[PDB]
Ligand binder design. Structure first.
Ligand code: ACO
Ligand code: CMP
Length: 326
């Protein structure tokens, strides 16, 4: 009954893989056909199953404890059902066919053989937590002047959210951040967007719909105990204390991630960033003309202006995203 290796060769998780690598698995799966409106999976059910989508589309619906449902979509080239099999846990979501759908599917054993394809298990994990991040609970954040926002992790869709959003990021902003006043290339947006949360962590703050700002760190290639950090705040939200908060938040996430030292780079002439830094120290060095750097140990307990309940919620959400699949 098995699948033609070509049949699986389009699936995102298999890209780069040598055809021979896929044969055992291609032998371990059966074809699946489903009509529009049909239910493939359900949120509490134990996981016996996984599916790879050749054609059609499916709605993903997750009911949080609040009782409100986050929705996403599963599309051709994508696995679904992998996560519960990854964590050995219940279905994270209910999955329903939108478009009539095909149709490669397998069981626990096929999954095993799949995981044993080199660098496949890793992709699966990455993408898994990537998806689980949508189900985490956005933390209410009320700044000193009363304006109310939300703290959550970046989602790939933030990319879209931001490009077509009504929130303005000035050329001067773009320049202070990326050193060009121009709007970020699609390639770049993808980079800022899709992350593993392990070597690349990103906070976004929103008005409750659209992201108004972000803070991220990327673990150093050679030294995993240090990461370079960066921030962006939308023009009209600047100067209200968002950046200070975000370095706190980022610091909690960092602590979780096993990161110790933050590295920073910036225009010598960008005062607020420098000020934020200066609160923790530390000495500035000149990296290049008009450009400065620095290195700080990560505060750390007692060194944060955030709160207790607050650092609790943050550390909780962060750790929830980071260790979700491991
Ligand atoms: C490592 C990197 O990310 S470098 C580049 C950073 N990103 C950018 O430059 C992009 C566009 N500009 C921004 O995003 C900036 O507004 C940020 C994020 C650097 C600043 O953070 P914000 O959220 O805007 O304001 P925030 O309230 O956190 O400012 C922090 C500190 O600088 C002070 N500050 C605010 N505005 C100004 C200003 N116009 N001039 C001087 N100091 C200022 C604040 O008082 C505060 O100091 P304090 O807490 O000791 O009193
Ligand atoms: N945000 C998302 N985007 C795409 N697919 C998802 C998302 N969240 C959950 N899923 C899939 O929905 C499945 C529901 O049950 P599982 O946890 O077995 O595995 C889950 C994932 O394969």
């Amino acid at each position: 009954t098995g699948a033609r290796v070509e049949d699986l060769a389009g699936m995102d998780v298999f890209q780069g893989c040598p055809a021979e690598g896929l044969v055992s698995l291609a032998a371990s799966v059966q074809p699946l056909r489903a009509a529009a409106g049909q239910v493939l999976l359900r949120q509490g059910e134990p996981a016996v199953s996984f599916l790879l989508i050749s054609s059609g589309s499916a709605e993903v619906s997750h009911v949080g404890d609040d009782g409100v449902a986050i929705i996403a979509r599963a599309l051709p080239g994508m696995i679904v059902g992998e996560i519960a099999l990854l964590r050995d846990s219940p279905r994270s979501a209910t999955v329903t066919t939108i478009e009539p759908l095909t149709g490669w599917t397998g069981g626990r054993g096929a999954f095993a053989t799949m995981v044993h394809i080199p660098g496949v298990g890793e992709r699966l994990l990455r993408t898994a937590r990537q998806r689980l991040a949508a189900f985490v609970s956005p933390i209410p954040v009320r700044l000193a002047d009363g304006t109310q926002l939300m703290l959550r992790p970046v989602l790939p869709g933030d990319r879209e959210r931001t490009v077509h959003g009504h929130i303005q990021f000035s050329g001067e902003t773009l320049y202070r951040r990326f050193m060009s006043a121009r709007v970020p290339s699609p390639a770049l947006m993808h980079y800022l967007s899709e992350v593993d949360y392990v070597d690349h962590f990103v906070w976004v703050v929103t008005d409750g719909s659209d992201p108004v700002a972000d803070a991220r760190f990327v673990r150093d290639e050679t030294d995993p105990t240090v990461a370079e950090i960066a921030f962006t705040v939308a023009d009209a939200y600047q100067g209200r204390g968002i950046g200070s908060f975000l370095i706190g938040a980022l610091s909690v996430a960092a602590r979780v991630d096993g990161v110790e030292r933050f590295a920073a780079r910036m225009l010598s002439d960008n005062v607020p960033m420098r000020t934020i830094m200066d609160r923790y120290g530390a000495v500035w060095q000149r990296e290049d003309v008009g450009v400065i750097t620095t290195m700080i140990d990560v505060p750390g307990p007692g060194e944060l202006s955030l709160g207790r309940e607050m650092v609790d919620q943050i550390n909780r959400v962060a750790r929830q995203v980071i260790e979700a699949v491991g």
